[PDB]
Amino acid sequence: KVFGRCELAAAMKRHGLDNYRGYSLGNWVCAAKFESNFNTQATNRNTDGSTDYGILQINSRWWCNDGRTPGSRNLCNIPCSALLSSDITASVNCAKKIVSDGNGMNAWVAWRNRCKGTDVQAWIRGCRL
Numbered sequence: 001k002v003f004g005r006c007e008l009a010a011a012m013k014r015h016g017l018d019n020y021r022g023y024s025l026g027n028w029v030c031a032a033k034f035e036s037n038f039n040t041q042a043t044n045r046n047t048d049g050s051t052d053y054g055i056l057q058i059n060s061r062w063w064c065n066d067g068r069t070p071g072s073r074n075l076c077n078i079p080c081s082a083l084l085s086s087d088i089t090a091s092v093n094c095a096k097k098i099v100s101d102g103n104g105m106n107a108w109v110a111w112r113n114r115c116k117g118t119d120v121q122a123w124i125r126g127c128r129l
Contacts, residue, residue, distance in 0.1 A: 001086040003038040003055070005029065006127035013129055015092040021099045026120030027111065032056060033123070034110035040086055054083035056091050056108070063094055
């Protein structure tokens with residue numbers, strides 16, 4: 001499933017991401033846009049054997065377990081397959097653990113490169129929230 005911008009904003013708000021650890025809703029929508037283009041089924045293989053999963057491209061070396069990644073830590077204690085659901089609950093719950101890790105949203109490369117410092121509020125304008 002590919003979420004629409006405003007549809008995703010509403011879902012992320014429902015799951016309590018607005019201002020979570022100091023990051024406004026627009027930051028999360030912006031991250032999803034550049035990480036997966038709002039695609040819940042996106043996957044990306046990396047040179048280290050790990051794979052990034054889902055709408056927020058969560059990595060299998062540190063956060064979820066896919067059983068084929070060396071040095072896996074599974075800090076979110078969840079199978080990576082659960083992050084490929086049309087329901088974003090699992091991804092949001094893990095993302096909350098990632099952002100509380102110590103480096104904020106810098107954990108998402110796409111966010112630091114394309115969202116940080118910009119008018120992220122633009123991502124929620126025009127939406128009924």
